[PDB]
Every structure is written in C-alpha cells, then in structure tokens.
Amino acid sequence: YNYAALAPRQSGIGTHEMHG
Amino acid sequence: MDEYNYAALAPRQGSRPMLSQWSGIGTHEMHGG
Amino acid sequence: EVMAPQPTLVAEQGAMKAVPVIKPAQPFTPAVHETQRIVTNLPITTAVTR
Amino acid sequence: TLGNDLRVDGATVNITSVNLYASFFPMSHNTASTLEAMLRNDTNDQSFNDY
Amino acid sequence: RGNLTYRLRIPVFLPLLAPIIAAAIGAIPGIASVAIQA
Amino acid sequence: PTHDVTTERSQRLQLRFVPVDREDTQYSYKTRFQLAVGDNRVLDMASTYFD
Amino acid sequence: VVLDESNPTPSYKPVTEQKVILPTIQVLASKKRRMAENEDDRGAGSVAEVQMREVKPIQTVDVSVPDHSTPMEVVQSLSRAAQVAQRLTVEAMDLSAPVDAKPLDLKPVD
C-alpha cells in the first residue's frame, strides 16, 4: 500500500437520497 | 541462503532444494564415429 | 573513486602454456565476497574478493 | 527399396502449406527478463559444435 | 511475505507464547490464516 | 593431456615372439617363448594371447 | 536494558530501535529483493507467519504481517500479547482436551 491508489493526475463520501 | 542464489526456483525435497552440481553446466558430444 | 583494475588471467593446460582464461565463476558468499560499486557516483554493484 | 528413378516413374509431390510451430516454456517474466539480460551479456555467449 | 517484519525478544509441558501470538495476530481484522512455524 | 603420458622414442605397440623352441607329441604341443618387457616400458598380461 | 542485538536474518534490516515494553519489540523492514513479475505481488495476500527462533541465553519470535495491516495496530497487539505471555509464563487450558468430562465423575465423588 502507498497512500491508496493514485488519482488521475493533472460530500465526497456518503449518500442521503430519500423521499417518495 | 535462498537470497544469494536461485534456490526457490529449484524443486524442493523437503527443506533442501535439489540443485545441480556446480560442474554440471556445459556439454561436449563430438566424434566422427 | 574509480574501481581498481582487475588482473587478467592466463592459465596453462597441456602443452598450451598461455591460454587466455577468464576469472573462474564462484557462487556469491558474504564471508568471501562483498558487493562494491564499480563507480561511486552511480550504483553498479558487483562481487569482489574483499 | 529399389534403386529406381522416381522422376521417370512419375512420382510427384505437391506442397500445400508450410508453417512452423514454436513452443515457449511459460516462465514468469520476472525470471525470464533476468535470464535474457544475463544471456545478452558477452561472457554468457552460447557455444555450439557440430557432432 | 511483506516488507515489514516485527521481532519480539521475550526474556522467557505445553507451549503458549506461539498460540498467544497467533491469537493476537488473528485478532487483526485484515489478517486471516495465521501460520505458526518453528 | 600431453605431458608424461606418451613417449616418442620409437617403440612398437605390438610384438610377436617367435618361440625359442618347440616340441610336439601325440598328446600335447609345447612351445617356449622368451619375452622381454623392454627396458622402460611395462607390459600388462591381459594382452599376450597365443596365436 | 537491551541485551541482544543480533539480527539473525541478513535480508531484513532494522528500521527502529529495540523499544521496550513496560520484553522488547524491534521493527525490521526488508531490503531490496529480486525482480517481481508484476507490482501487485508483494502486498498481495493476508496470511501472517509467526516464525520461532532458538532460545538465546531469551526467546525471539519473527512475526510477519501483510503490508495493509496498520503498523500501530500490529505493534499494540504484539505488545499486549507479549505482556500476556510474560504474565502467564494452567487448568483452564487443560480443560480444553485432556481432562475429559465423564471420566471427571469418579474422582469428584470417589
């Protein structure tokens, strides 16, 4: 491991989708 | 010792890998008869 | 520091008394052989007889 | 089995297709690259002799 | 194997240190199938 | 090898010894040979077959 | 304080000093190795090896964990295990095979 996988070089986490 | 030579490549016989004798490489077959 | 020159070998076999001969091959052993850079600037390690 | 001329006898050969089948030993590129590098050196040249 | 190796130098019937270390390693969520060799 | 393995001083590989004396009888044929093993050569008696 | 500094394996080099447990714990990284066929070969895996070393007049254990494991968690778990082993070095372990249950009915009453 090395600081996770690299990102493509040049709320992030979670969803709150509800209602119906 | 498996880091100073190719011993993981050779098939094992328990804990001792079965390497060839040092003077085993090379061949010579030659005659005219 | 440049690597010190290695002596060339010439052996004898039969009547042949001046056959050119390369240094014999020996399996690497830490007690006898050590890895020394040929040129200190860039790492090209090789075995020497200490 | 008879020392007879086949040209006059009329035997003919007609070659349809010619291919060669190379066989590769599957060896991990880890050690295969090392082996080819060590055999690409000048001291590890392969010597062959006619029998 | 792994790049990092940890070494413990304990001052020191049935052996117990090896089972204890194996259980401790198995307690790690990301590690399974602890192997004991002597 | 070529050192102290073979001479060049003109000695024969095979020697034929004519019998010194011969005597025949209705029962047996007896021959006597006087073989000399050189001066600086060694003979092996695995050779020396009667002809 | 700090009795043995031997490094039985030459291929692994120390990276931290022999920190003491209030045994001692030493973390050793691995030197360079041969080529790998592909980069996804070193950290790939989950099995951990706990190698035993001959007693040096003290015992040494070589525990190797896969890369993805957190070094802090591994160190803390090893320290707790070492403390437990030092404290305990019983009948509870004996109960879990060579004591039996039905045979443990003559002795208790007769």
From Swiss-Prot, chain D:
Induction: Expressed in the late phase of the viral replicative cycle.
Organism domain of life: Viruses
Location in the cell: Virion; Host nucleus
Note, other: All late proteins expressed from the major late promoter are produced by alternative splicing and alternative polyadenylation of the same gene giving rise to non-overlapping ORFs. A leader sequence is present in the N-terminus of all these mRNAs and is recognized by the viral shutoff protein to provide expression although conventional translation via ribosome scanning from the cap has been shut off in the host cell.
Membership in a protein family: Belongs to the adenoviridae hexon protein family.
Function of the molecule: Major capsid protein that self-associates to form 240 hexon trimers, each in the shape of a hexagon, building most of the pseudo T=25 capsid. Assembled into trimeric units with the help of the chaperone shutoff protein. Transported by pre-protein VI to the nucleus where it associates with other structural proteins to form an empty capsid. Might be involved, through its interaction with host dyneins, in the intracellular microtubule-dependent transport of incoming viral capsid to the nucleus.
Subunit structure: Homotrimer. Interacts with the capsid vertex protein; this interaction binds the peripentonal hexons to the neighboring penton base. Interacts with the hexon-linking protein; this interaction tethers the hexons surrounding the penton to those situated in the central plate of the facet. Interacts with the hexon-interlacing protein; this interaction lashes the hexons together. Interacts with host dyneins DYNC1LI1 and DYNC1I2; this interaction might be involved in intracellular microtubule-dependent transport of incoming viral capsid.
Official protein name in the record: Hexon protein
Provenance organism: Bovine adenovirus B serotype 3
Name of the gene this protein is made from: L3
Residues of the full protein shown: 558 to 608 of 911
